[PDB]
Amino acid sequence: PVTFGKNDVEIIARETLYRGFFSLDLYRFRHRLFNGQMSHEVRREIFERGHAAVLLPFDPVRDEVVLIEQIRIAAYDTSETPWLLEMVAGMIEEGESVEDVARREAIEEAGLIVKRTKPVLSFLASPGGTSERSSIMVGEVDATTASGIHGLADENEDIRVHVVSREQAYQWVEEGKIDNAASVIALQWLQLHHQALKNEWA
Amino acid sequence: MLKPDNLPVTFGKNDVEIIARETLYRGFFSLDLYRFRHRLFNGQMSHEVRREIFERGHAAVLLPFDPVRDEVVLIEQIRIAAYDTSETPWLLEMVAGMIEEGESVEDVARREAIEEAGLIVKRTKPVLSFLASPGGTSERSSIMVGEVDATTASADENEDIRVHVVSREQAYQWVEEGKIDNAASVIALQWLQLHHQALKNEWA
Ligand SMILES: [Gd+3]
Ligand SMILES: [Gd+3]
């Protein structure tokens, strides 16, 4: 399929336009046109904010899924509410594995202890404006042991756990009641592979 | 009075308030800074919270699908941002384009289908709209499946965009193996692998 590779691109230079907690970078480069020639200097503004580790909490026996609720203001302007139904996830720091970063966040965010995890898919949220990459992973868990609201909240990441059936969470995806990238993919992947997974596990 | 809309979530837009939006940087793509407060699940009010948001505009995505031949039309194209975490910045994607004032999702989809793939979309169908990374971007992409005729595959941006026609099954397998890892394509192709027989019957 794809022809060209990293030797077909010459990155002239990069710059940081802004730098707070997250940075916005500038990539200047030239590449192979599909007709064989190189292109002029091309410019692209790239949002650089690290890579993500995701984790789909799935209870094989009960055939349920554990969802995480929280606010995401970014969603405000194009959704009925900034509060979203999500998967477990954290930003991958220094030299951490996605597996660990994912199991570590399953305790913190949903108070669950993942037992047996399996990789799903690794995607780019939007190659057109951000270098961010997400690795999903499916994780076996007992829905029954989820935690609840925190009396003394984490205003940074204030979370409310939601436990629903596998089949339902999926309809919410099809219904548009679950529209963040990580969730839709993971849940879509589950709908296509659940029967095989319930048998492999349990 | 009129009853409140339903929410599969606990709080609505009325439970948070956006104090302001300072601006960190501005290009054709801006980086804004939201300052806001909101209810916590413990029933209390949060102190002021600041968050950097990549304002990137919103897109229109189209999945070129040939029911009768059961093929899909892909677009190959470079996306520098994948350089650092991919073996190649050249990705296989769907027909997409930015939606701007006075334009409907279906319009951009139909327009971009001709200038990127040189295909003429017949019947279209709303599949699903998703948020890329609500934790740092406001971006939103709406998807549609476009009834196409793979033989008609062509194309304007040809030196900047190469079109590939493959069968549904081969495309999906490339998502499974990771040869297709961009959100728009992954979400689209999975949806299709779950509905094709019904879509083929519908457009039959
Ligand atoms: Gd955390
Ligand atoms: Gd265009």
Short mmCIF file of C-alpha atoms and ligand atoms in Angstrom, two decimals:
data_model
loop_
_atom_site.label_atom_id
_atom_site.label_comp_id
_atom_site.label_asym_id
_atom_site.label_seq_id
_atom_site.Cartn_x
_atom_site.Cartn_y
_atom_site.Cartn_z
CA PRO A 1 0.00 0.00 0.00
CA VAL A 2 1.95 3.00 1.33
CA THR A 3 5.10 3.75 -0.65
CA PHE A 4 7.01 6.59 0.93
CA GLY A 5 8.85 6.55 4.23
CA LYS A 6 11.02 8.72 6.49
CA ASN A 7 13.75 9.09 3.88
CA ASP A 8 11.21 10.77 1.60
CA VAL A 9 10.81 13.59 4.09
CA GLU A 10 13.36 16.17 5.12
CA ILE A 11 12.47 18.02 8.29
CA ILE A 12 14.16 21.39 7.85
CA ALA A 13 13.29 22.41 11.43
CA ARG A 14 10.85 22.62 14.35
CA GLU A 15 10.01 25.42 16.77
CA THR A 16 7.85 25.86 19.83
CA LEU A 17 5.30 28.62 19.24
CA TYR A 18 3.92 28.31 22.78
CA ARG A 19 4.83 26.28 25.86
CA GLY A 20 2.74 26.00 29.01
CA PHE A 21 1.88 22.55 30.33
CA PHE A 22 1.39 21.51 26.73
CA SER A 23 3.30 22.85 23.73
CA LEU A 24 2.30 23.90 20.22
CA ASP A 25 5.06 23.21 17.69
CA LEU A 26 5.94 24.16 14.15
CA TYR A 27 7.19 21.60 11.66
CA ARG A 28 8.93 22.92 8.55
CA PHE A 29 9.71 20.30 5.92
CA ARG A 30 9.66 19.13 2.28
CA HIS A 31 8.52 15.72 0.96
CA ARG A 32 8.16 13.43 -2.06
CA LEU A 33 5.18 14.41 -4.17
CA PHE A 34 3.24 11.46 -5.59
CA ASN A 35 4.73 12.24 -9.00
CA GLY A 36 8.28 11.81 -7.74
CA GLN A 37 9.36 15.39 -7.11
CA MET A 38 9.95 17.11 -3.78
CA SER A 39 7.64 19.81 -2.45
CA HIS A 40 8.40 23.36 -1.44
CA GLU A 41 8.95 24.13 2.23
CA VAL A 42 5.73 23.08 3.96
CA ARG A 43 4.53 24.46 7.29
CA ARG A 44 2.35 22.78 9.87
CA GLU A 45 1.30 23.86 13.41
CA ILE A 46 1.33 20.79 15.65
CA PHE A 47 -0.22 20.46 19.10
CA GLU A 48 2.24 18.39 21.19
CA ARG A 49 0.84 17.10 24.47
CA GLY A 50 2.32 13.63 24.94
CA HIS A 51 0.88 10.17 24.25
CA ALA A 52 -1.97 8.37 25.92
CA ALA A 53 -2.59 4.99 27.49
CA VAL A 54 -6.22 3.83 27.52
CA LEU A 55 -7.86 0.83 29.19
CA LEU A 56 -11.19 -0.81 28.44
CA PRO A 57 -12.53 -2.27 31.73
CA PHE A 58 -14.46 -5.43 30.80
CA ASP A 59 -16.17 -7.93 33.14
CA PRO A 60 -16.34 -11.26 31.16
CA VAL A 61 -18.71 -13.08 33.54
CA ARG A 62 -21.26 -10.30 33.91
CA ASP A 63 -20.57 -9.14 30.34
CA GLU A 64 -20.58 -5.54 31.55
CA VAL A 65 -18.31 -2.55 30.98
CA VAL A 66 -17.10 0.04 33.51
CA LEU A 67 -17.38 3.63 32.25
CA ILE A 68 -15.72 6.78 33.70
CA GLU A 69 -17.61 10.09 33.89
CA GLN A 70 -15.97 13.51 34.03
CA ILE A 71 -15.85 16.98 32.52
CA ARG A 72 -13.93 18.00 29.40
CA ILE A 73 -14.58 21.69 28.65
CA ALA A 74 -13.08 21.32 25.17
CA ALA A 75 -16.25 19.41 24.31
CA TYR A 76 -18.41 22.33 25.49
CA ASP A 77 -18.78 24.15 22.18
CA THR A 78 -20.01 21.15 20.16
CA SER A 79 -21.82 18.91 22.61
CA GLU A 80 -24.90 19.12 24.86
CA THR A 81 -22.61 18.74 27.86
CA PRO A 82 -18.89 18.87 28.81
CA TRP A 83 -19.39 15.83 30.99
CA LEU A 84 -18.35 12.73 29.08
CA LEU A 85 -18.57 8.93 29.40
CA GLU A 86 -15.00 7.66 28.97
CA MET A 87 -12.53 4.83 29.29
CA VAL A 88 -9.78 4.74 31.86
CA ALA A 89 -6.65 6.59 30.73
CA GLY A 90 -3.63 8.57 31.75
CA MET A 91 -0.74 10.35 30.09
CA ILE A 92 2.30 8.13 29.59
CA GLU A 93 5.17 9.63 31.60
CA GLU A 94 8.94 9.16 31.18
CA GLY A 95 9.76 5.46 30.77
CA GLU A 96 6.41 3.85 31.56
CA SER A 97 4.73 1.04 29.65
CA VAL A 98 1.19 1.60 28.43
CA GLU A 99 0.21 -1.59 30.27
CA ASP A 100 1.34 -0.19 33.58
CA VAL A 101 0.15 3.36 32.95
CA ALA A 102 -3.23 1.75 32.19
CA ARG A 103 -3.42 -0.55 35.23
CA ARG A 104 -2.20 2.31 37.43
CA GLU A 105 -5.06 4.56 36.23
CA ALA A 106 -7.66 1.79 36.61
CA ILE A 107 -7.05 1.84 40.36
CA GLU A 108 -6.90 5.62 40.65
CA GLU A 109 -9.79 6.50 38.30
CA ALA A 110 -12.16 3.53 38.81
CA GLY A 111 -10.73 1.86 41.90
CA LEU A 112 -10.50 -1.44 40.06
CA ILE A 113 -7.73 -3.97 40.03
CA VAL A 114 -7.19 -5.22 36.52
CA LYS A 115 -6.34 -8.91 36.35
CA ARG A 116 -5.22 -9.97 32.87
CA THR A 117 -4.87 -7.29 30.26
CA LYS A 118 -4.67 -7.64 26.49
CA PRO A 119 -3.71 -5.04 23.84
CA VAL A 120 -6.38 -3.80 21.44
CA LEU A 121 -5.38 -0.98 19.02
CA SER A 122 -3.06 2.04 18.97
CA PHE A 123 -4.32 5.14 17.16
CA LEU A 124 -3.64 8.76 16.27
CA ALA A 125 -6.49 11.02 17.48
CA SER A 126 -5.92 13.38 14.56
CA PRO A 127 -2.69 13.21 12.46
CA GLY A 128 -3.66 16.58 10.96
CA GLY A 129 -2.99 18.67 14.06
CA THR A 130 -1.61 16.63 16.94
CA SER A 131 1.16 14.09 17.41
CA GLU A 132 -0.84 12.41 20.17
CA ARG A 133 -1.02 8.61 20.01
CA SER A 134 -3.28 6.35 22.14
CA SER A 135 -2.85 2.64 22.99
CA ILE A 136 -6.07 1.01 24.17
CA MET A 137 -5.70 -2.41 25.89
CA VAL A 138 -8.60 -4.44 27.23
CA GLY A 139 -8.58 -5.29 30.91
CA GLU A 140 -10.38 -7.99 32.85
CA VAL A 141 -12.14 -6.79 35.98
CA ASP A 142 -14.96 -7.40 38.51
CA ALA A 143 -17.52 -4.65 37.84
CA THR A 144 -18.89 -5.29 41.34
CA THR A 145 -15.85 -3.73 43.03
CA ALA A 146 -15.92 -0.25 41.44
CA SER A 147 -15.46 2.75 43.76
CA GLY A 148 -17.75 5.76 44.25
CA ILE A 149 -17.64 9.55 44.48
CA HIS A 150 -14.80 11.03 46.52
CA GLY A 151 -15.83 13.16 49.50
CA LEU A 152 -12.68 15.23 49.13
CA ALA A 153 -12.52 15.57 45.33
CA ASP A 154 -9.66 15.67 42.82
CA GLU A 155 -10.66 18.88 41.01
CA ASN A 156 -8.09 18.11 38.33
CA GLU A 157 -9.60 14.67 37.54
CA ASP A 158 -13.00 14.46 39.38
CA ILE A 159 -14.51 11.07 38.41
CA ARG A 160 -17.77 9.14 38.76
CA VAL A 161 -17.83 5.44 37.83
CA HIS A 162 -20.74 4.05 35.75
CA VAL A 163 -21.43 0.33 35.31
CA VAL A 164 -23.59 -0.77 32.38
CA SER A 165 -23.92 -3.84 30.18
CA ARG A 166 -21.62 -4.49 27.21
CA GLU A 167 -24.52 -4.40 24.77
CA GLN A 168 -25.82 -1.11 26.09
CA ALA A 169 -22.63 0.86 26.24
CA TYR A 170 -22.29 -0.09 22.58
CA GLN A 171 -25.73 1.17 21.62
CA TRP A 172 -24.87 4.45 23.30
CA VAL A 173 -21.91 4.60 20.91
CA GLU A 174 -24.18 3.93 17.94
CA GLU A 175 -26.67 6.42 19.43
CA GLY A 176 -24.02 9.09 19.80
CA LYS A 177 -24.23 9.17 23.60
CA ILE A 178 -20.55 8.12 23.63
CA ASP A 179 -18.48 10.08 21.11
CA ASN A 180 -14.94 10.54 22.35
CA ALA A 181 -12.41 8.72 20.16
CA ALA A 182 -10.87 6.35 22.69
CA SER A 183 -14.30 5.06 23.76
CA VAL A 184 -15.91 4.59 20.36
CA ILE A 185 -12.92 2.57 19.09
CA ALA A 186 -12.48 0.40 22.20
CA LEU A 187 -16.20 -0.27 22.47
CA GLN A 188 -16.43 -0.93 18.72
CA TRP A 189 -13.55 -3.32 19.05
CA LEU A 190 -15.36 -5.04 21.90
CA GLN A 191 -18.56 -5.43 19.92
CA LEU A 192 -16.62 -7.21 17.16
CA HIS A 193 -14.51 -9.38 19.48
CA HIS A 194 -16.50 -9.94 22.70
CA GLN A 195 -17.62 -13.51 22.04
CA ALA A 196 -14.02 -14.54 21.33
CA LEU A 197 -12.81 -12.69 24.41
CA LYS A 198 -15.38 -14.06 26.83
CA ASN A 199 -14.31 -17.56 25.82
CA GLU A 200 -10.61 -16.85 25.95
CA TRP A 201 -11.05 -15.40 29.42
CA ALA A 202 -13.16 -17.18 32.03
CA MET B 1 -42.74 24.34 31.53
CA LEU B 2 -40.67 22.42 28.99
CA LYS B 3 -38.90 19.41 30.54
CA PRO B 4 -35.08 19.22 30.65
CA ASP B 5 -33.23 17.29 27.98
CA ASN B 6 -31.98 13.82 28.89
CA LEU B 7 -28.36 13.16 29.73
CA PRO B 8 -26.54 9.82 29.96
CA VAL B 9 -24.17 11.81 32.19
CA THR B 10 -24.66 13.48 35.62
CA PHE B 11 -24.18 17.20 34.93
CA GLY B 12 -25.12 19.54 32.10
CA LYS B 13 -23.92 22.88 30.74
CA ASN B 14 -25.74 24.63 33.58
CA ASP B 15 -23.48 23.01 36.18
CA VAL B 16 -20.30 24.67 34.92
CA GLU B 17 -19.55 28.30 34.09
CA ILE B 18 -16.80 29.61 31.84
CA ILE B 19 -15.26 32.67 33.45
CA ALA B 20 -13.16 33.55 30.40
CA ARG B 21 -10.85 32.42 27.60
CA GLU B 22 -7.44 34.06 27.58
CA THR B 23 -5.42 33.41 24.40
CA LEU B 24 -2.04 31.72 24.59
CA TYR B 25 -1.17 31.78 20.90
CA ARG B 26 -2.82 32.38 17.51
CA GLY B 27 -2.13 31.06 14.01
CA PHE B 28 -4.50 29.46 11.51
CA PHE B 29 -4.92 27.16 14.50
CA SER B 30 -5.17 28.81 17.90
CA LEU B 31 -4.33 27.67 21.42
CA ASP B 32 -6.85 29.02 23.92
CA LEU B 33 -6.95 28.88 27.70
CA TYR B 34 -10.29 28.10 29.35
CA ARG B 35 -10.88 29.39 32.92
CA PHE B 36 -13.88 27.81 34.60
CA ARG B 37 -15.60 26.31 37.65
CA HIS B 38 -18.05 23.42 37.84
CA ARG B 39 -19.98 21.18 40.22
CA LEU B 40 -18.09 18.19 41.61
CA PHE B 41 -19.82 14.84 42.09
CA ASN B 42 -19.71 15.52 45.83
CA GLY B 43 -22.17 18.35 45.26
CA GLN B 44 -19.65 21.13 45.74
CA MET B 45 -18.24 23.84 43.54
CA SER B 46 -14.74 23.54 42.10
CA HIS B 47 -12.13 26.26 42.54
CA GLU B 48 -11.25 27.97 39.25
CA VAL B 49 -9.63 25.55 36.79
CA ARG B 50 -7.44 26.50 33.81
CA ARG B 51 -6.92 24.34 30.73
CA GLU B 52 -5.04 24.85 27.43
CA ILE B 53 -7.23 24.01 24.42
CA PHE B 54 -6.11 23.42 20.87
CA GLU B 55 -8.83 25.13 18.81
CA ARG B 56 -8.54 23.36 15.49
CA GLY B 57 -11.86 23.81 13.74
CA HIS B 58 -14.07 20.85 12.84
CA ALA B 59 -14.10 18.23 10.09
CA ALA B 60 -16.28 16.33 7.65
CA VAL B 61 -15.36 12.68 7.06
CA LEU B 62 -16.59 10.32 4.32
CA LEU B 63 -16.21 6.53 3.96
CA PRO B 64 -16.18 5.61 0.23
CA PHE B 65 -18.13 2.34 0.08
CA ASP B 66 -19.04 0.18 -2.93
CA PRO B 67 -21.77 -2.27 -1.74
CA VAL B 68 -22.05 -4.36 -4.90
CA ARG B 69 -18.29 -4.85 -5.27
CA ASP B 70 -17.88 -4.67 -1.50
CA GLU B 71 -14.84 -2.43 -1.85
CA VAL B 72 -13.59 0.68 -0.07
CA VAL B 73 -11.69 3.65 -1.52
CA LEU B 74 -8.77 4.98 0.50
CA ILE B 75 -6.67 8.15 0.34
CA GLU B 76 -2.91 7.99 0.99
CA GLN B 77 -1.41 11.21 2.32
CA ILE B 78 1.39 12.58 4.51
CA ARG B 79 0.67 13.76 8.06
CA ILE B 80 3.94 14.97 9.58
CA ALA B 81 2.62 14.78 13.16
CA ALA B 82 2.77 10.96 12.93
CA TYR B 83 6.49 11.14 12.15
CA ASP B 84 7.63 10.64 15.75
CA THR B 85 5.37 7.70 16.62
CA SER B 86 4.89 5.98 13.29
CA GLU B 87 7.10 4.19 10.79
CA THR B 88 5.85 6.59 8.11
CA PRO B 89 4.09 9.96 8.08
CA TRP B 90 2.21 8.59 5.06
CA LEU B 91 -1.18 7.39 6.25
CA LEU B 92 -4.18 5.69 4.61
CA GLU B 93 -7.26 7.76 5.33
CA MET B 94 -10.84 8.63 4.50
CA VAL B 95 -12.06 11.63 2.52
CA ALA B 96 -12.12 14.53 4.98
CA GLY B 97 -12.19 18.30 4.88
CA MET B 98 -12.78 21.27 7.15
CA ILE B 99 -16.34 22.52 7.52
CA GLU B 100 -16.72 26.29 7.64
CA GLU B 101 -19.54 28.81 7.66
CA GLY B 102 -22.60 28.09 5.56
CA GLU B 103 -21.45 24.52 4.81
CA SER B 104 -23.11 21.26 5.81
CA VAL B 105 -21.20 18.13 6.74
CA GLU B 106 -22.63 16.29 3.74
CA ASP B 107 -21.58 19.11 1.42
CA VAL B 108 -17.92 19.07 2.38
CA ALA B 109 -18.03 15.26 2.20
CA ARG B 110 -19.45 15.34 -1.32
CA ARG B 111 -17.02 18.09 -2.38
CA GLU B 112 -13.87 16.53 -0.93
CA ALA B 113 -14.81 13.17 -2.51
CA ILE B 114 -14.37 14.59 -5.99
CA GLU B 115 -11.19 16.61 -5.42
CA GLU B 116 -9.33 14.03 -3.33
CA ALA B 117 -10.64 10.77 -4.80
CA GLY B 118 -12.30 11.96 -7.97
CA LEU B 119 -15.27 9.79 -7.04
CA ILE B 120 -18.89 10.83 -7.34
CA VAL B 121 -20.84 10.05 -4.18
CA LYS B 122 -24.41 8.92 -4.75
CA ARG B 123 -26.40 8.17 -1.61
CA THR B 124 -24.81 9.29 1.67
CA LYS B 125 -25.68 8.24 5.19
CA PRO B 126 -24.93 9.72 8.64
CA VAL B 127 -22.76 7.21 10.47
CA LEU B 128 -21.39 8.99 13.51
CA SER B 129 -19.71 12.14 14.87
CA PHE B 130 -16.84 11.94 17.41
CA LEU B 131 -14.52 14.15 19.49
CA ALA B 132 -10.82 13.55 18.81
CA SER B 133 -9.33 14.25 22.27
CA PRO B 134 -11.78 16.27 24.42
CA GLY B 135 -9.00 16.53 26.97
CA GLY B 136 -6.95 19.00 24.96
CA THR B 137 -8.75 19.78 21.69
CA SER B 138 -12.17 20.99 20.69
CA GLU B 139 -11.98 19.15 17.33
CA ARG B 140 -15.05 17.24 16.16
CA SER B 141 -15.43 15.02 13.10
CA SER B 142 -18.72 13.82 11.65
CA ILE B 143 -18.79 10.65 9.57
CA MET B 144 -20.91 9.47 6.63
CA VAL B 145 -20.76 6.45 4.33
CA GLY B 146 -20.87 7.49 0.71
CA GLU B 147 -22.29 5.12 -1.90
CA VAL B 148 -19.53 4.93 -4.48
CA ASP B 149 -18.55 2.88 -7.54
CA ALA B 150 -14.94 1.70 -7.11
CA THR B 151 -14.46 1.46 -10.88
CA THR B 152 -14.98 5.25 -10.94
CA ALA B 153 -11.86 5.61 -8.76
CA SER B 154 -9.45 8.30 -10.00
CA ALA B 155 -7.72 13.65 -9.56
CA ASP B 156 -6.76 17.28 -8.74
CA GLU B 157 -4.56 16.69 -5.66
CA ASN B 158 -3.17 13.50 -7.22
CA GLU B 159 0.43 14.63 -6.67
CA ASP B 160 -0.46 15.37 -3.04
CA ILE B 161 -2.95 12.52 -2.54
CA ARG B 162 -2.82 8.99 -3.96
CA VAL B 163 -6.04 6.96 -4.04
CA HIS B 164 -6.13 3.22 -3.32
CA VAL B 165 -9.07 0.89 -3.89
CA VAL B 166 -9.24 -2.28 -1.80
CA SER B 167 -11.89 -4.70 -0.59
CA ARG B 168 -13.72 -4.16 2.69
CA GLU B 169 -12.10 -7.24 4.23
CA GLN B 170 -8.56 -6.13 3.34
CA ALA B 171 -9.16 -2.66 4.77
CA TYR B 172 -10.47 -4.03 8.07
CA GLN B 173 -7.53 -6.43 8.32
CA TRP B 174 -5.24 -3.40 7.96
CA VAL B 175 -6.98 -1.77 10.92
CA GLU B 176 -6.56 -5.03 12.88
CA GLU B 177 -2.86 -5.21 12.07
CA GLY B 178 -2.34 -1.49 12.50
CA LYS B 179 -1.68 -0.43 8.90
CA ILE B 180 -4.56 2.00 9.40
CA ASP B 181 -4.31 3.75 12.76
CA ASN B 182 -5.83 7.20 12.33
CA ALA B 183 -8.99 7.74 14.37
CA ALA B 184 -11.32 8.70 11.49
CA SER B 185 -10.46 5.57 9.49
CA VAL B 186 -10.39 3.18 12.43
CA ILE B 187 -13.80 4.32 13.73
CA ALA B 188 -15.26 4.32 10.21
CA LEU B 189 -13.98 0.94 9.04
CA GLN B 190 -15.01 -0.75 12.30
CA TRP B 191 -18.50 0.73 12.02
CA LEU B 192 -18.64 -0.67 8.48
CA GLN B 193 -17.39 -4.10 9.45
CA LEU B 194 -20.37 -4.13 11.83
CA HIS B 195 -23.03 -2.91 9.42
CA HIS B 196 -22.02 -3.71 5.82
CA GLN B 197 -24.53 -6.53 5.21
CA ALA B 198 -27.36 -4.23 6.33
CA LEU B 199 -25.95 -1.31 4.30
CA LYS B 200 -25.57 -3.51 1.24
CA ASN B 201 -29.20 -4.55 1.65
CA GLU B 202 -30.33 -0.97 2.13
CA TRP B 203 -28.57 0.31 -0.96
CA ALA B 204 -29.39 -2.88 -2.91
GD GD C 1 -4.86 10.28 36.41
GD GD C 2 -10.01 20.36 0.24
#
